[PDB]
C-alpha cells in the first residue's frame, strides 16, 4: 500500500465512489 502515493490513492478511491 505504501508503494503508491497516498495523496493520489485516496483521490482515486474518491473518484471511484463518486
Amino acid at each position, epitope marked *: 500500500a505504501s508503494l503508491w502515493n*497516498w495523496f493520489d490513492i485516496t483521490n482515486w478511491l474518491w473518484y471511484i465512489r463518486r
Partner: antibody
Amino acid sequence: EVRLVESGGGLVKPGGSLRLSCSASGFDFDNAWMTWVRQPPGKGLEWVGRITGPGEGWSVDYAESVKGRFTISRDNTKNTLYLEMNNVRTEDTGYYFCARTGKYYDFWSGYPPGEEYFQDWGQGTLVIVSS
Amino acid sequence: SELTQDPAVSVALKQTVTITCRGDSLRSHYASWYQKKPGQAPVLLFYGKNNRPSGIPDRFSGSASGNRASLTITGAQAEDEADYYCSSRDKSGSRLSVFGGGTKLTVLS
C-alpha cells in the same frame, strides 16, 4: 517495543539555528510517516510538520506559522528524524515531540487525503529561545 | 483556531462526560483524540470512524456529526483526569493537520 527519543534541545538565541533529532526503533521506520509536534509552556499541542514515505517522494508539509524557517528531513540509514530550526523566534519556545504517524481513509465516507493520527510519541525535548 | 474545544470540563466519579471539538474540516474529515498528562507523552485514544487502539479502556469512544467531533468517557475514573486534544485537517482536503485548543478534564475528588 516502539521507542522514540528526542534530543538536541537547549538554549538558542533569537535568529539562531538548532537541530533536533529523533531516533526511532521497534517499527518499520522507512515506510512510516513521521510528525513533529510542539507544546509551548502552559499551552496546547501544535502541529509543526510531517514527512511522508517513499511512495510520496518523501514530501514534507509544514504549519503556516512555521514555513520558511523550519526544515524536516529523515535519515533512513540511521533511523532518525530531523527538525532544523532557522531564524528561530521566541514563540518557538516549547517542548518538541516526534510522533509515528498513521494514515486513515474510509472508502465510503472519507474525503481525500483522509486523516493522519499519531500512534506513538516520544517524551519530548525542551527548546528555549532567549537573547 | 480551526478546531475549537471547551477549555475545562468536570465530571463526577463513575459518571459520563462528553468533550466536543468543532471546526469546518470535521464536516469532511474524521478526528483523532489524545490524552495528555503533565510530564508524559500524549496517548492516542480514538481515531477514524470507530477505531480504538488496543490497551485503551472501552470507556473511551468517539463520534461525529455535522462540524462536531465528540469524545465520550463512560464511567470516568480518577486516572482519566488529564488534558484531551482533538486533531484533524485544518481545511477540507488539506495536507496539513491541526490540534484543538485542548480540554482540561477534572474528575471531581
